[PDB]
Every structure is written in structure tokens, then in C-alpha cells.
Amino acid sequence: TPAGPLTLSGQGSFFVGGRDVTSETLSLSPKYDAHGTVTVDQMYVRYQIPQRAKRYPITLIHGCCLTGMTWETTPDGRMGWDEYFLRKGYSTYVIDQSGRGRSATDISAINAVKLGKAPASSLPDLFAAGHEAAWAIFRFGPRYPDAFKDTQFPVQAQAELWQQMVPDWLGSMPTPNPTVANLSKLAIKLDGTVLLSHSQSGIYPFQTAAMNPKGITAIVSVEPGECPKPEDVKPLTSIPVLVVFGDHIEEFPRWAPRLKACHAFIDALNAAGGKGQLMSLPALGVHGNSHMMMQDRNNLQVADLILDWIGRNTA
């Protein structure tokens, strides 16, 4: 944990993309006009630039049920990857996905239903993760609230983890998510960035690269919900890819086939003349990591492994 002060050459915030929508259900009060134009699908980006920044920034992309908070102070109060990457001399761009956190949703259809201007079927598909289900999906232990004896997650700060979990609007937006096109715009503007994503967003950087490879220096995908199909690897052959998996995988039916499918993806990518690696942490002698490995007690060691791979693959 590099202690002491942190010096920033630059910092700021901006949005990427967005579309203007005409609505007639913005308000339910006669005090406000229900007719107007709003901007939706834009992506919030917060950036920090260290002194003597390395050539390529890292863009950090959270998964479901969470925001860019994912990468900030861990639930138990320790340094997160955002601060760590900065201290290691990488410029960092931390997003909130379209329709999440500080990135605006459209509430038009909800108010439409409440006003009678649309049927209940127009209501968006929404999801929030309960503590009990999250426990098992995160692989903290076999069932809530029992932890694996060797878990790296600070389970004593479980209440704080729950504080950072939010409703997810993914199901009410297209596939690919508008985040995908926004990530292409960001990478082009930056003229080269490493895209580092997680879980729900694990597939995003591959989808972005398939849309337009420009500006995508490398991909790091942490325990993705899905990897690209073996037959889809051709457009990816020029971009170094790292897929990272933690521990206690085989005991979970949700996770075991994903690791298997990701191995198949990496193998096919490499067979096609590409450059992929499946980093399994237990195979490297690093044990106990949860799905929330960026927040685990050895999160900086996990960061080092990833950063070493980035350094060797962006030279």
C-alpha cells in the first residue's frame, strides 16, 4: 500500500454520447410541463491524470448492480484500484455505465404508465440484487451469510458492500448496451486506452472492438458473464486480451461453465494468431479471491499481476 500524498497533473469529469428524446410524460404535476426534451444514454466519466503518465490510460468499467464506486475505496476502507493505478503512473477513466449511477435513465415510460398514456408492458425491465443472492453470486461462501474460511473478501464489511449496490436498468436498454458505443467514442478520443471490465460488462470491450477496433490498446476482462464465441475471434487478433478468474470456481454452477467457455475463447484466439491469456489466480498460487477481487484483502496483489501483464503487452 503506497502511503503518503498523491499528486495529480490533471482531474475532471465529462460525459460521452447520449441521445435527445422528446417526451410528453416528464412530470406528473400540473406545476411542470410534462412536454420537453431530455438527454438519455450518455456515459459519465471521471478521470485522474498522474505526473509523467504512461502512454495508455486504463478505463475501468463496472458490472451489474454497482457503479464506478466499484473501483474506489473498498467497503472496509482500503485503497482501491482507481487510486492504486494512479500511484503506479496510469491515467484512469472511471465510468458509470449508461443508465446507471450519474448516467441518466429515461423515466418517460414509467410516468406514461402512471398517467394512462401507455400500458404496463411499456414499463422497463428492472433488477436489484438482494444480499442473499449476491453472497452466492460473489462466491463469498456456499450460502448467505456463511463465508469460506479462506475468503479474501472483507466479509466483516458486508453491510458497507450492500450500501454500494444499486438497481440495474440493463434489461430496458438495447444489446449491445449503449455503454459499448460510448466506450468506442472514449477510446478514439483518448487515441488509445486499455479497457478493464467486470462480470456483466466483461463482454463489453470485445463488443466495442468488434464495432470498431480503433483506440483499443488492450482488453482486461475480470470474471466476465460471457466471453466471445470461439468463432468470433478474428476481429480480436490484433488486441492483447487478459481474462482473469478468482477462486472457488468449480463449486458454483453459475461460474464453472464460464471459466471453461473463457478457456475455449482464449485458446481459439491464440490459435487464430491473437494474443490472449486466461489468468487463473489459484493456478498462480493466489487463493481465496471472490468475484469482487478488486475489493478483496489482496486486491493490490491482484492489481500488480494485471498491471504486469498490461506493461508487457503495451510496450
Per CB under 8 A, the segment of 120-128, 207-215, 221-229, 307-315 that binds a second copy is 120-128
Instruction: Specify the 3-state DSSP secondary structure of 208.
Output: helix
Q: How many residues does the chain have?
A: 315
Nearer to ligand W22, 47 or 135 (CB): 135
Q: How many residues bind ligand W22 (CB under 6 A)?
A: 12
Q: How many residues bind a second copy (CB under 8 A)?
A: 73
When binding is defined by CB under 6 A, the residue of 124, 192, 213, 225 that contacts ligand W22 is 225
**CB–CB of 53/89 below 8 Å?**
yes
Q: How far apart are CA 14 and CA 10, in angstroms?
A: 13
Phi-psi region of 125 (alpha: psi -120 to 50; beta: other; left: phi over 0): beta
Q: Does 18 bind a second copy (CB under 8 A)?
A: yes
Name the helix (H) or strand (E) containing 37. Answer: strand 36-40
CA dihedral 55, 279, 209, 170 (to 10 degrees): -110
Q: Does 65 bind ligand W22 (CB under 6 A)?
A: yes
Per CB under 8 A, the segment of 157-165, 179-187, 188-196, 303-311 that binds a second copy is 157-165
Cis peptide before 228 (omega within 30 of 0): no
Q: How far apart are CA 310 and CA 92, in angstroms?
A: 14
When binding is defined by CB under 6 A, the residue of 66, 209, 266, 310 that contacts ligand W22 is 66
In the window 87-106, what residues touch ligand W22 (CB under 6 A)?
none
214 binds, among ligand W22, a second copy, none (CB under 5 to 8 A by kind): none
In the window 171-230, what residues touch a second copy (CB under 8 A)?
171
Q: Does 256 bind a second copy (CB under 8 A)?
A: no
Q: How far apart are CA 131 and CA 144, in angstroms?
A: 8
Per CB under 8 A, the segment of 37-45, 213-221, 238-246, 273-281 that binds a second copy is 37-45
Q: Does 156 bind a second copy (CB under 8 A)?
A: no
In the window 3-62, what residues touch ligand W22 (CB under 6 A)?
none
Residue 24: CB atoms within 10 Å: 14
Q: Does 238 bind a second copy (CB under 8 A)?
A: no
Q: How far apart are CA 259 and CA 5, in angstroms?
A: 39
H-helix segments, 164-283: 178-190, 204-211, 256-271
Nearer to ligand W22, 43 or 64 (CB): 64
Site residues (vs ligand W22, CB under 6 A): 63-66, 129, 133-134, 137, 199-200, 225, 291
